[PDB]
Design a protein around this ligand. Structure first.
Ligand SMILES: Nc1nc(Nc2ccccc2)sc1C(=O)c1cccnc1
Length: 294
């Protein structure tokens, strides 16, 4: 736009493109997300405009929403790096546990806030978590919900990452609960610790079976109602559960205990963000500053 002197492209989310841009008059640097559509509906702005009144230190601030010309531009405060890039940069040495703990704690604070205000993220992944030089981490790109996963991709031809998707979604549940966000965050937590994605599936069934191979194929005992799920098949292979000592070494018992509660199959048994903040794992939490190379 003529209002922004687009600096550079910084991403390709799942609904459009994200640019780093400067407000020619204010001189502010922001992240400008363009969204794709027979004139772009208006039943979205209502829930979008809501996200705008959702301010928390661990949530990327949505500054402006502009529909004009039937295109929809989202203007967010700009952060210099995402967690995916930081994880990659920290691959050889690993993110120090104290920083891993700080980030997890802040993200749970952010989710606790969203959830208490009936807002679900729905698509948490490293690329959607932003960090700054001050040690903060913030939730971004709330998948804007749109329709709980609809359409399905950006707008042209991109391969959506399934690695952080909760089992109930993969089994066809039509109504997501706040529990889906805790699952994704648990997966991210594991990844920061081991430096390898926990469940790197390449298709919906491979994603589901990677989960089953590690946590055991769910049954009515651990997940009441699972065999009645839309996409559940009695023909699913029956895998035995593995121990967390083997899944996220060398994370300590407090860490493993918290992770196990974030990864419970039954959405109803999965720990809430609020309850997770009280877990003994955070007894000694602090706020370290990351070594950010910008
Ligand atoms: N505010 C913000 N800053 C960002 N900064 C940034 C800096 C360096 C590399 C990549 C992103 S991204 C970003 C976003 O609101 C966002 C993120 C992911 C999908 N859609 C929108």
């Amino acid at each position: 736009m003529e209002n922004f002197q687009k600096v550079e492209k910084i991403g390709e989310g799942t609904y459009g493109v994200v640019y780093k841009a400067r407000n020619k008059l204010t001189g502010e640097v922001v992240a400008l997300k363009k969204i794709r559509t027979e004139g772009v509906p208006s039943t979205a702005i209502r829930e979008i405009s809501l996200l705008k009144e959702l301010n928390h230190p661990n949530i990327v601030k949505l500054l402006d929403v502009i529909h004009t010309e039937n295109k929809l531009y989202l203007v967010f405060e700009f952060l210099h790096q995402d967690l995916k890039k930081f994880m990659d940069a920290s691959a050889l040495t690993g993110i120090p546990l104290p920083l891993i703990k700080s980030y997890l704690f802040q993200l749970l604070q952010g989710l606790a806030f969203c959830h208490s205000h009936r807002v679900l993220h729905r698509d948490l992944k490293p690329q959607n978590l932003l960090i700054n030089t001050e040690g903060a981490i913030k939730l971004a790109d709330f998948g804007l919900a749109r329709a709980f996963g609809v359409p399905v991709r950006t707008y042209t031809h991109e391969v959506v990452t399934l690695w952080y998707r909760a089992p109930e979604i993969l089994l066809g549940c039509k109504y997501y609960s706040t529990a889906v966000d805790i699952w994704s965050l648990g997966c991210i937590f594991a990844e920061m610790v081991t430096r390898r994605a926990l469940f790197p599936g390449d298709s919906e069934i491979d994603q589901l079976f990677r989960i089953f191979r590690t946590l055991g194929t769910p049954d009515e005992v651990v997940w009441p109602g699972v065999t009645s799920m839309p996409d559940y098949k009695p023909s699913f292979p029956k895998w035995a559960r593995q121990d967390f000592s083997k899944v996220v070494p060398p994370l300590d018992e407090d860490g493993r205990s918290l992770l196990s509660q974030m990864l419970h199959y039954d959405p109803n048994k999965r720990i809430s963000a609020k309850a997770a903040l009280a877990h003994p794992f955070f007894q000694d939490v602090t706020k370290p500053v990351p070594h950010l190379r910008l």
